[PDB]
Amino acid sequence: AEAWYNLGNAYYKQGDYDEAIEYYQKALELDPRSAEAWYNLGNAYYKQGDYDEAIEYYQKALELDPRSAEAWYNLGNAYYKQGDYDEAIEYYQKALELDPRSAEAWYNLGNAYYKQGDYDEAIEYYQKALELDPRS
Numbered sequence: 001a002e003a004w005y006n007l008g009n010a011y012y013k014q015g016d017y018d019e020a021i022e023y024y025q026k027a028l029e030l031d032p033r034s035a036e037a038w039y040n041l042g043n044a045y046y047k048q049g050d051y052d053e054a055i056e057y058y059q060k061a062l063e064l065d066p067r068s069a070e071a072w073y074n075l076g077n078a079y080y081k082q083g084d085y086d087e088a089i090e091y092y093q094k095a096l097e098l099d100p101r102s103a104e105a106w107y108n109l110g111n112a113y114y115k116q117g118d119y120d121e122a123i124e125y126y127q128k129a130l131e132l133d134p135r136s
């Protein structure tokens, strides 16, 4: 499974998401245990703009490792891309409980509240983001 997974990773890293999906799926047929495998399969679908597929496999990754701030965050992103800002906020919240150091994660939490027209909540999370990284 690991060699198939590494092939998928190499394709993913050069931006060939169709090939990444093929070889990630092969790795999971042999070893469905890896959270990082389901997570990166989700990432591959996300990068294609196949957000329902991304959501399906992010959930699988989270069921195997619910401590994964990265998986919660990317699940948030998939909903944000669908315009589901309520679900985006819910999953960003869980990501930021597990790792509150990511200026990027606070920023996108702010963006999700901004998109709902909740400007004071946007301000709160933008302020946190800029406290960590004041360059953007």
Ligand SMILES: [Cl-]
Pocket: 015, 016, 017, 018, 019
């Ligand atoms: Cl391609």
Ligand SMILES: [Cl-]
Pocket: 018
């Ligand atoms: Cl193709």
Ligand SMILES: [Cl-]
Pocket: 018, 019
């Ligand atoms: Cl192909």
Ligand SMILES: [Cl-]
Pocket: none
């Ligand atoms: Cl083909």
Ligand SMILES: [Cl-]
Pocket: 049, 050, 051, 052
């Ligand atoms: Cl789709």
Ligand SMILES: [Cl-]
Pocket: 050, 052, 053
């Ligand atoms: Cl589909």
Ligand SMILES: [Cl-]
Pocket: none
């Ligand atoms: Cl399906």
Ligand SMILES: [Cl-]
Pocket: 082, 083, 084
């Ligand atoms: Cl939607």
Ligand SMILES: [Cl-]
Pocket: 081, 082, 083
């Ligand atoms: Cl949208």
Ligand SMILES: [Cl-]
Pocket: 084, 087
């Ligand atoms: Cl929905």
Ligand SMILES: [Cl-]
Pocket: 116, 118
């Ligand atoms: Cl709200």
Ligand SMILES: [Cl-]
Pocket: 118, 121
């Ligand atoms: Cl509000």
Ligand SMILES: [Cl-]
Pocket: 118
């Ligand atoms: Cl409100």
Ligand SMILES: [Pb+2]
Pocket: 016, 018, 019
């Ligand atoms: Pb191709």
Ligand SMILES: [Pb+2]
Pocket: 050, 051, 052, 053
């Ligand atoms: Pb789809």
Ligand SMILES: [Pb+2]
Pocket: 053, 056
């Ligand atoms: Pb599917």
